[PDB]
Amino acid sequence: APPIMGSSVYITVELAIAVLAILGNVLVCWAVWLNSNLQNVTNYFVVSLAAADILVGVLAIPFAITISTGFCAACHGCLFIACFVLVLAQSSIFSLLAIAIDRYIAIAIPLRYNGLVTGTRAAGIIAICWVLSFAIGLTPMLGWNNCGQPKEGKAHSQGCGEGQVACLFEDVVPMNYMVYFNFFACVLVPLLLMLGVYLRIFAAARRQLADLEDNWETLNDNLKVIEKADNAAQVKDALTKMRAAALDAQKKDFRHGFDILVGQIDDALKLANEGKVKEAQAAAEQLKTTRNAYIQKYLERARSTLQKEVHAAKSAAIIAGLFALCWLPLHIINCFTFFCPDCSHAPLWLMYLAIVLAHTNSVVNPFIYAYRIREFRQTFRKIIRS
Ligand SMILES: CC(C)CCC[C@@H](C)[C@H]1CC[C@H]2[C@@H]3CC=C4C[C@@H](O)CC[C@]4(C)[C@H]3CC[C@]12C
Ligand SMILES: CC(C)CCC[C@@H](C)[C@H]1CC[C@H]2[C@@H]3CC=C4C[C@@H](O)CC[C@]4(C)[C@H]3CC[C@]12C
Ligand SMILES: CC(C)CCC[C@@H](C)[C@H]1CC[C@H]2[C@@H]3CC=C4C[C@@H](O)CC[C@]4(C)[C@H]3CC[C@]12C
Numbered sequence: 030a031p032p033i034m035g036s037s038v039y040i041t042v043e044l045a046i047a048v049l050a051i052l053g054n055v056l057v058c059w060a061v062w063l064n065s066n067l068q069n070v071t072n073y074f075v076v077s078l079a080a081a082d083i084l085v086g087v088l089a090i091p092f093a094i095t096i097s098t099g100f101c102a103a104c105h106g107c108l109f110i111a112c113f114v115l116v117l118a119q120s121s122i123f124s125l126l127a128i129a130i131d132r133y134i135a136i137a138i139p140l141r142y143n144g145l146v147t148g149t150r151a152a153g154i155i156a157i158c159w160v161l162s163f164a165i166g167l168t169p170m171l172g173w174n175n176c177g178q179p180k181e182g183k184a185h186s187q188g189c190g191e192g193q194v195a196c197l198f199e200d201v202v203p204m205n206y207m208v209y210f211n212f213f214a215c216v217l218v219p220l221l222l223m224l225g226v227y228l229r230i231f232a233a234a235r236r237q238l239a240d241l242e243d244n245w246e247t248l249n250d251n252l253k254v255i256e257k258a259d260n261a262a263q264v265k266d267a268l269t270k271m272r273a274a275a276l277d278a279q280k281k282d283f284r285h286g287f288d289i290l291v292g293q294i295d296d297a298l299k300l301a302n303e304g305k306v307k308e309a310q311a312a313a314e315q316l317k318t319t320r321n322a323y324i325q326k327y328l329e330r331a332r333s334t335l336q337k338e339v340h341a342a343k344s345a346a347i348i349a350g351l352f353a354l355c356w357l358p359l360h361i362i363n364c365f366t367f368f369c370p371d372c373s374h375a376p377l378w379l380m381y382l383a384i385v386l387a388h389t390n391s392v393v394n395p396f397i398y399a400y401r402i403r404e405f406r407q408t409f410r411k412i413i414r415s
């Protein structure tokens with residue numbers, strides 16, 4: 030069958046993906062630019078990721094269309110056409126890893142997050158990661174390429190000129206680079222690091238939530254202990270455990286509530302130390318008023334903040350997982366090409382499918398933000414309506 034027919038389907042699909050990648054990710058950038066509620070360090074990496082995806086549509090997809098034709102080119106110019114998409118994928122990986130680390134810092138040390146993770150430092154990190162992405166993705170242009178061993182028969186058959194090759198991805202980019210350096214070292218290892226970070230994020234959230242509930246139960250259990258105590262020493266034991274737990278939960282209406290709680294524990298402790306059991310128990314009963322009016326409100330707000338962090342971490346993890354799902358088939362095919370020379374090469378239609386799937390990753394993030402983050406979804410609606 031004429032190659033232009035199957036080429037037409039592949040090219041049409043690539044162009045459709047390019048349009049959608051541009052439109053959706055331009056919308057992401059317009060949303061962060063316009064909405065100050067979206068202007069935080071996490072979303073600066075989101076914007077960097079959306080910029081990489083815009084460039085997939087503007088440059089990498091036109092380059093992929095071009096390299097599918099095998100047109101005659103100087104080999105090093107062919108290399109750039111071949112490898113620029115690896116720059117964008119590498120930049121995406123750095124942004125994804127940054128987002129993961131950012132959410133870990135926010136959940137593990139929220140008291141020093143704002144002083145540690147700043148906008149100026151983030152912009153510097155983004156710049157360094159773009160430079161590193163060019164270095165990693167264009168490493169074949171530094172000499173790790175097949176330009177020294179051109180396919181002269183293929184070039185002659187296509188009428189290429191002297192010093193030119195048929196510009197095809199697997200003819201110029203070495204597969205050992207693609208498998209060992211790009212895939213294993215530069216893609217698989219960072220994705221596994223992201224997995225580790227997300228595992229630590231969710232474990233940290235679950236621990237802080239058993240801790241919030243454990244302190245709440247300890248407060249209520251020790252109150253019952255005081256009510257049914259029969260001597261001052263038992264009242265004293267329970268209050269001492271309550272006092273240490275109250276300060277542990279303390280680490281304007283928030284501070285006042287815990288100021289009342291500790292002060293009321295101290296009142297009952299002094300009565301308990303005087304052997305006045307009934308008076309200490311009555312003073313300890315006043316703690317329930319503070320618990321209902323203040324402490325329970327702090328417990329439901331701390332729980333609410335943690336659940337929103339879990340939700341935001343899951344949204345980011347879905348983005349990272351979709352990157353892996355969209356890119357792994359192409360990398361896995363390269364592994365079969367490289368590691369199994371006795372295996373027939375993956376057919377051309379499957380190569381095209383795996384390439385298109387990798388590009389489709391540049392469409393999906395705007396949808397995840399719209400469905401999972403209300404501030405983005407609402408800002409998307411205002412932009413579209415207006
Ligand atoms: C800032 C942006 C818009 C600039 C985009 C420039 C792109 C399209 C340019 C930069 C380098 C160029 C390549 C440089 C060298 C060669 C080798 C030549 O034998 C065929 C064309 C080819 C393969 C060029 C294709 C076009 C190219 C990829
Ligand atoms: C990462 C998740 C989505 C799994 C993706 C698995 C895909 C990429 C796997 C599953 C089965 C695989 C194929 C199984 C057998 C062959 C025949 C061989 O001569 C060339 C490679 C080829 C054609 C493989 C290419 C990659 C392949 C299609
Ligand atoms: C965490 C996971 C997803 C990492 C990705 C798994 C990759 C590295 C694994 C999955 C299946 C594997 C392939 C399965 C079958 C073969 C055929 C054999 O003749 C050579 C190795 C080769 C080609 C393997 C190479 C590595 C491979 C592609």
Ligand SMILES: CCCCCCCC/C=C/CCCCCCCC(=O)O
Pocket residue numbers: 103104105106107109
């Ligand atoms: C914002 C605009 C920034 C402009 C930076 C330009 C960077 C792109 C340059 C690419 C040069 C690579 C082409 C060299 C191939 C020559 C072929 C050969 O030597 O065999």
Ligand SMILES: CCCCCCCC/C=C/CCCCCCCC(=O)O
Pocket residue numbers: 373374375376379
């Ligand atoms: C999620 C399901 C995906 C839906 C469509 C995917 C179709 C592509 C799947 C291919 C599996 C293996 C194809 C093997 C092709 C023949 C290999 C060969 O002869 O060399």
Ligand SMILES: CCCCCCCC/C=C\CCCCCCCC(=O)O
Pocket residue numbers: 086087088090091092094095098099100101
């Ligand atoms: C600003 C949007 C970016 C520009 C998109 C341009 C769309 C054209 C798509 C692909 C370019 C294909 C170049 C043709 C390959 C040469 C064919 C040959 O010489 O054999």
Ligand SMILES: CCCCCCCC/C=C\CCCCCCCC(=O)O
Pocket residue numbers: 149150151152153154156157160161164
């Ligand atoms: C060819 C490049 C290979 C080596 C990569 C070097 C790493 C990137 C170098 C310079 C990045 C410049 C921006 C640095 C500003 C830092 C701001 C900050 O972190 O607060």
Ligand SMILES: CCCCCCCC/C=C\CCCCCCCC(=O)O
Pocket residue numbers: 157164165
């Ligand atoms: C594959 C290429 C290897 C890259 C070489 C490694 C060198 C670059 C690495 C990190 C750059 C660190 C940023 C330091 C710049 C100043 C920061 C500051 O002022 O605080």
Ligand SMILES: Cn1c(=O)c2[nH]cnc2n(C)c1=O
Pocket residue numbers: 093096111114115198199207359360363380384
């Ligand atoms: C990233 N990448 C690949 O890994 C690959 N393998 C075979 N063709 C390929 N193409 C066109 C590609 O862009």
Ligand code: NA
Pocket residue numbers: 078081082117118121390391
């Ligand atoms: Na990407």
